[PDB]
């Protein structure tokens, strides 16, 4: 996690956050995504979803995983929840309520921990 990964998205245009890493065969991995809607604001963060899996590393066989948890934040606003997959978070129609800071954390059985911070804004509207 070097610094903020800035994402300029177009209005109602999808955005996909990707956290690329090479995992170790057999190690069990757990990922969490947290959303701070600080951009539209006008250790407590909203865990979007927590997932876990075990790396099979066949490079082709789509890896199964477990949806450990998912918050109901976006449903309280009657908006669709993000699509969370190993290493990626997807939003189909970017809107004001989706702007802000996304924090991705991955912890592995091998004793490894990795972070990644994203700042999703709008181009032409900042």
């Amino acid at each position, epitope marked *: 996690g070097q610094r903020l990964i800035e994402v300029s998205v177009e*209005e109602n*245009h*999808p955005f*996909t956050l*990707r*956290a*690329p890493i090479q995992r170790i065969y057999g190690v069990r991995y757990t990922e969490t995504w947290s959303f701070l809607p600080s951009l539209t604001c006008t250790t407590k963060e909203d865990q979007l979803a927590e997932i876990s899996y075990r790396f099979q590393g066949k490079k082709e066989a789509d890896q199964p995983w477990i949806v450990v948890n998912t918050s109901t934040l976006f449903d309280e606003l009657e908006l669709d929840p993000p699509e969370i997959e190993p290493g*990626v978070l*997807k939003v*189909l129609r970017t809107e004001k309520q989706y702007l802000g800071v996304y924090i991705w954390n991955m912890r592995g059985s091998d004793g490894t921990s990795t972070y990644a911070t994203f700042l999703v804004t709008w181009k032409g509207d900042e």
Partner: antibody
Amino acid sequence: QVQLQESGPGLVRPSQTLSLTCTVSGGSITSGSFYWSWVRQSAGKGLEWIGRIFKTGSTTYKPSLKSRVTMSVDTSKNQFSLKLSSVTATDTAVYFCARAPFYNDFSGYSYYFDYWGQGTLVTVSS
Amino acid sequence: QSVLTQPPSASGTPGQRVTISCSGSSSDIGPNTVHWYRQVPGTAPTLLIYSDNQRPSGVPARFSGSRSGTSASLAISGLQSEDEAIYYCAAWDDSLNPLYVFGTGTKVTVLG
């Protein structure tokens, strides 16, 4: 297994409207993080990108063509469609449809064409 | 409307390492990634490299990519008769008027 096929080639008289459509096989355009896009290649003029559409209807057009280019999608028939207006003879090119993954990472915005379709020679000549 | 500058043609004998360059701006390649495509005459282009270094499944490891600042490059190590084609680079311009800028085109000719 993902296949893309365009409408047939033909003559278009200058200063009228060009319409092409691309049909997808091996899946549905409603899968995530995929832009359905059109590019073109006129012999001697290399590769030129026309535009992209998403399943939501959000589009992005090449700025030189925004005044004349329109794109539409149909998730019911897995079909994305392109309309170019006020066509000149220099618009004679092979028009390729393509699927494009897209994501933001610590490197930036990645947007590439992995599964292309074949081409159709649209000739704009009187 | 923009273009990514590429050598008009590269060449090498079978087994050499051939490099193709891709020069850009701070609105393309600079802030965003570079992707490399291969076109054999008569057939549509095929993806060779994505995300500056990542290879599609079926693309041999002798093809490599790199990016530094406003420029990017492709390496065909172990040049072979099959690698003779036109090579294009591309990147996204996220200006206020966004677009997908392609390259001029580079044709590798396998000599010898």
